[PDB]
Design a protein around this ligand. Sequence first.
Ligand code: CL
Ligand code: CL
Ligand code: OH
Ligand code: ZN
Ligand code: ZN
Ligand code: ZN
Length: 230
Amino acid sequence: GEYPTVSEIPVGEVRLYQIADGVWSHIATQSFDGAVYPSNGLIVRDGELLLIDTAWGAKNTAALLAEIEKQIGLPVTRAVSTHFHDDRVGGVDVLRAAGVATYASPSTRRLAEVEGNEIPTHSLEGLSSSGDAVRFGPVELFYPGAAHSTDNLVVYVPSASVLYGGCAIYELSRTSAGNVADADLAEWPTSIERIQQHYPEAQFVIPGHGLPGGLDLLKHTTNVVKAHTN
Ligand SMILES: [Cl-]
Ligand SMILES: [Cl-]
Ligand SMILES: [O-]
Ligand SMILES: [Zn+2]
Ligand SMILES: [Zn+2]
Ligand SMILES: [Zn+2]
């Protein structure tokens, strides 16, 4: 409202939502565990376009690039995967084939390889330690520590005050913990606080899945994960 939900997007298709000038999110849907799950990403204008995360599938990522050209008309040249799970590196092959330079942290590339997922080409330097931040085009890449995964990153747009938290951040509609298989429930709460303390000026917070909001998503996630912990 007007952000597109799980309904409002047929499977295989992708839709864009402009959050600010030169800043969009791309919304896709996927069937897993017997439920249609939505999934968010980010598109940031870089003068060319910088992509954050795939659209959760080769077919969806192809629809993503197709939708970008239809409605933005600028070429995607770089892509970054926030962690190694298939909903973030799934479609990296399609991106690579189209001429996009794909990026990811050394940890993410390794864990993706071990898991047997698509491996981004380039290695992002300087995100090894908890609290590390780097500059990659119009965004700042930040590693808050282990949370949803030991390797998850969050993306911030200092030009639009947009904070893309990936799956490390739950939407408000989510009451319980999602996929915590490779998650660190012990370090998750500390990691969320690093984001809060490093990006207290975020206007719009984009979770990995669902509707966007404000910084209130952080302690909400903290409330969910801590409840799941017990
Ligand atoms: Cl390159
Ligand atoms: Cl390349
Ligand atoms: O994920
Ligand atoms: Zn994941
Ligand atoms: Zn390259
Ligand atoms: Zn996820």
